[PDB]
Design a protein around this ligand. Sequence first.
Ligand SMILES: CCCCCCCCc1ccc(CC[C@](N)(CO)COP(=O)(O)O)cc1
Lengths: 280, 220, 58, 231, 337
Amino acid sequence: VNYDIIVRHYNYTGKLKLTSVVFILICCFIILENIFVLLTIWKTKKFHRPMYYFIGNLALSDLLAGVAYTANLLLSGATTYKLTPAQWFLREGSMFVALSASVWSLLAIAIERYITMLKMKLHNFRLFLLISACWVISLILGGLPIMGWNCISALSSCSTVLPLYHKHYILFCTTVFTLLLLSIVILYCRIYSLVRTRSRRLTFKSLALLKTVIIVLSVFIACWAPLFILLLLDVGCKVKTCDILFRAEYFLVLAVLNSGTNPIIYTLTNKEMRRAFIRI
Amino acid sequence: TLSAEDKAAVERSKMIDRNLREDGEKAAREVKLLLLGAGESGKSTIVKQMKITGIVETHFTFKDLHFKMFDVGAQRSERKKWIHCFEGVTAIIFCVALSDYDLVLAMNRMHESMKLFDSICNNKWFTDTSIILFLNKKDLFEEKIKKSPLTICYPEYAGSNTYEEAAAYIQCQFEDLNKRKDTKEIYTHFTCSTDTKNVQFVFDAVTDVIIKNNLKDCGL
Amino acid sequence: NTASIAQARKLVEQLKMEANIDRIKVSKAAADLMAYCEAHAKEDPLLTPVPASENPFR
Amino acid sequence: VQLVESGGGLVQPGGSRKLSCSASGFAFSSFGMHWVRQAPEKGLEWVAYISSGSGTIYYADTVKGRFTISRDDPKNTLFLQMTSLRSEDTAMYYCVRSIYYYGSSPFDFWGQGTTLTVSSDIVMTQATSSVPVTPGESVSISCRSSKSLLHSNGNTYLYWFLQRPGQSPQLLIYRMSNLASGVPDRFSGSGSGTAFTLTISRLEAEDVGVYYCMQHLEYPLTFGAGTKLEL
Amino acid sequence: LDQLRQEAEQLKNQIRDARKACADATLSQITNNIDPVGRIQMRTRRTLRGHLAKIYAMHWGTDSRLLVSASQDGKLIIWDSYTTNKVHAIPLRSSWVMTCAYAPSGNYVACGGLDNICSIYNLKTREGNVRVSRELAGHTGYLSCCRFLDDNQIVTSSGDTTCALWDIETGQQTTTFTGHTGDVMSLSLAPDTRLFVSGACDASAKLWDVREGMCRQTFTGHESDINAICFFPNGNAFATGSDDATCRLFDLRADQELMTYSHDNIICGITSVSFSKSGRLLLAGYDDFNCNVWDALKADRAGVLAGHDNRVSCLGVTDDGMAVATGSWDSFLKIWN
Ligand SMILES: CCCCCCCCc1ccc(CC[C@](N)(CO)COP(=O)(O)O)cc1
């Protein structure tokens, strides 16, 4: 754990406060929204069903991601080369874990909905199974860099955005993200198709469902596209050959802001929520 | 820290729980319909034409759905002491007869049916519960109208002795009473006494209720 | 008719029967109720809880 | 109620044999079943136990591994399969009924039994193997044990049975104090841990036989030596 | 007719005068030197699960150890309350059931509902299963409740303005009690088992005899129908819970109501009431998802057993007084002490 290593890397790639204020304000806004949603959910006796527990889980994941991003912002700057390798590795891992947990919660909600609307619950093992799976896989994926995955042994194999993260880590994580996004899109498209087909055959504003599907998917993709694109580019460029990578600080601010609109897209299209949010 | 006998007691209790859950899962598949109408409103012909003391239950099957239909009209008591028992049913089938438009009971039978429908449709227990409305005896209604217009009981009527005009005006006069149009809904039909369409219509209304309940259930 | 006359007579007789009863000063009723509430106090397990040792439900 | 067993006879050393028991007159698929046995001139001995739902089984340490116990509810039958029989296994064998829930009475109905011939636990003993009595005499009998039976939930798993000459046993007192149904009220039993006493008032005829005491605290189940009233 | 009406009015005025004359004081004006109990902190010890529908009644056994509960999925269940073990489960013929009872000897149970008959089951057979022993018929409207007198006599009430006393062994009514105008909701046998009390859906209650057929007393004062009724232990009192959001305490010797039990924040109707042993806790459900615990001698509290997600329909205490059971439309039974 010799800090000299750190320094050399930040020289090899080329790295070696209003913006922070704006970002921390954004984080406070997100925290306020998520805590309001949690308080409204967990204190209405009609809101004690599995779906509302899934919603609370998503809100909790968003809160954790916001807090982690705030903490990471507070400790950047020159301090980036005044720490021991382990502390910096932990600082990165916390952010990464929260960012994975958010998407896993979204997928859990999508799967639950899709199951409910199939000829399978028409008219609580899966609950704990899904929550455990999401949290455990998030933690497991987060903690690799301490367990051997790093390029301190070869500065030639390091990236530009993260000069101590072997490129295989980045590629693997982006593959995971792409898989999850495709799965969610497929699930929601199929739900809409199913409802339309079922209600299209009765003879004697039929759906007006497209509204929520469009809102959800459009916001999700429009918020999460840039960081994914930037990291995919980063894994594809040579050292000190692309200069955009020195601007990533303004891209991540979107990937976390996505955690501030879910408490609205999953709260304003629901009538009963809209009625219960008269007084949080 | 259990003796030799408490473990057998626990095994017995778990067997009982197993059987209870099996029965509940089997019983969570059926549809319940509550049937209502006025005196001589013709619910008997609906019960009959489909080939199907206290409460009287009948049941049938159709296109993979198992219907239980309960008739409670065989009691003469105060209506308000039951409906909590029925707040779970899927739908309410309400029957009235058209030919009785000018038969004075005082004032007419249709006025009695209007009062009954207005009372039921806006009861506090039925806010999400839908109603399927049957208008019966259309042929005799048309025969009577040919000589006696609706002005006898609907002086404000604007049409003449035309079947469509009178029937549509009466239909709207009843379907107006739906004062909860944003949560409840009303279906309407004309008894096809020689057809099978009645059961298909019941099937369609029930399926619509099912789909709407499933959409509301999962937040979507 | 005869039925209404019978109903009126039955109501009158029932009222007369109910009236022909000795009354009790409300003070004595209150004293008796309070006395019964005082007598069995120590044996009311939910007004004076049973210590956990002798509890059947823990 | 009726239990009828079959499958006995003679078996030479080695070989095997299967005994069957048919039940009629009750809900066979709610009861657990025991197999018990008795030597020609000695006390009783428990053999095996099968439970309701087949989720539990127990055997005796003496001959474990050679005996199999099975049931068939749709046909209401109970089977025991035994192999490689020795000369030690000449005896008569009974099938017994028992149902456990809060307040029930196990071991109440006994079968009739079949004869078979071949060419760290709790101890309990009867004080005496015989006693002379006369009609009108107040009789009492004793049993001793090597450990307390009073479990900390309040029970006391002592049982008293009676076998008249040429019949099957007949439950008298279950859990050390309670009288089975159909027993004249002149019987009674009590005692303090490890020392117990049965008492028969106003001795009549048909009260002469052999009296046994058993415990049901923990498998294995151990019988007594057997006491006799001579008269 | 008209002269009979005049006599009725004169007797009514005389009864009013007699009732008012004895009112030298009010319970609250004498029972004002009493330390209030204060807070009553209760908690769930067990949670009895297994029903899959609304629960409409329960009733304790005289040993204080076993329970019987009835739900609208068509099931009676018998519970061990010390371990949460099921001892028996009994399937019913019709699922529109509204009342239960437990035999004082433990041999039998009874039930009834919207089918106009009362069914009696025997628990202790040599065959090892529970099976029906009797079905009583003769009533013309639905059935509200039924309480064993012994192994061979049962009293029932129905929404027809009538009640009946039945001899189980034969199946024929032994006497009938008439004189109401609306439906009958609930009745409670006396501790000494020689009278009973009946409330009807006209805000009127009565004290009824058993072997004569003739009512001894009548009581009025509520504004709407009566939803529950029970009997304070001493033998000469009873508390009414009505659907106009009120409770009141009626006594038989004074011939008038003494104390009322209401709160402005309550706008619902009580679905069941019960007493505590000594007489210092009156327990009452409501339609606002709670189950309050009032103090009888003061009208000054409500300790809440807030554990349910729907309306509390049934609640009861034991004979030794060490527990309380409650059941509600959310399909769960809870035990408190
Ligand atoms: C399914 C999930 C997909 C992957 C999630 C993408 C987030 C990964 C991530 C990258 C970088 C950072 C930290 C970046 C900085 N802390 C400021 O932006 C660099 O600072 P200096 O050390 O260059 O000064 C945090 C998380």
